[PDB]
Amino acid sequence: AKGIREKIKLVSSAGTGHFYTTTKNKRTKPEKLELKKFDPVVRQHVIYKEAKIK
Amino acid sequence: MDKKSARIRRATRARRKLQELGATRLVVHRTPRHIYAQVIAPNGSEVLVAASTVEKAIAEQLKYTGNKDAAAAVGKAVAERALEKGIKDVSFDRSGFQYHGRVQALADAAREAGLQF
């Protein structure tokens, strides 16, 4: 589980707004890159590059 | 087609009868020569209809030559205007197989002054 090798936790984040949204990922599998949409405090979606940006 | 099978996505939407129920369809047909159409209440009232090529209309054999967006369109026009009642009631035209060209010209031929989506 909490093996520093397999699945970890993805804090994730958005671009200006101070949101959160969390999920899981890996390590060996291609990483050091991420970004989806998700809905912030309010309004539109967009950005949410989270940690590990392209 | 239907020969080799029926067990294909072709029936997936035809079961619009559930939930949508009242949702009426157009069916539309291919058959190289004609196109057909007809509109009936879902399943609760097949006792409804529209019109295919309906030969008699202006002349006797529905004097029309072609089958492209030209003939295909009118192929619908009749069901459309003749079924003025049903339009706002939101029908639906069911691809049957594919939504391109012939059936497109047939479907869109209705979208103009008819079937409010």
Binding site: - | K17, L18, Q19, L21, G44
Partner: protein
């Protein structure tokens, strides 16, 4: 972490399966009909299957919602009591 010993003495602590909501009740947007748990759409159930099949609820309020997929997928139509 050895709790391995077969013995074959081991439960499941089963739940939810039950055929609750038997027959055509007075109605209500109650569950009635669940079996395998998951479930999705359903609406005024009509009891379906195949070959034999096709239960006939006939009575409900306006949206039973229940039956997953092991028992007559979806349902509802025009049936209420007088009409729908």
């Amino acid at each position: 972490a050895h709790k391995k010993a077969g013995g074959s003495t081991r439960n499941g602590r089963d739940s939810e399966a039950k055929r609750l909501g038997v027959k055509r009740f007075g109605g209500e947007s109650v569950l009635a009909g669940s079996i395998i748990v998951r479930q999705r759409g359903t609406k005024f159930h009509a009891g379906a299957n195949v070959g034999c099949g096709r239960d006939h609820t006939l009575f409900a309020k306006a949206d039973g919602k229940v039956k997953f997929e092991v028992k007559g997928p979806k349902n509802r139509k025009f049936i209420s009591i007088e009409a729908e």
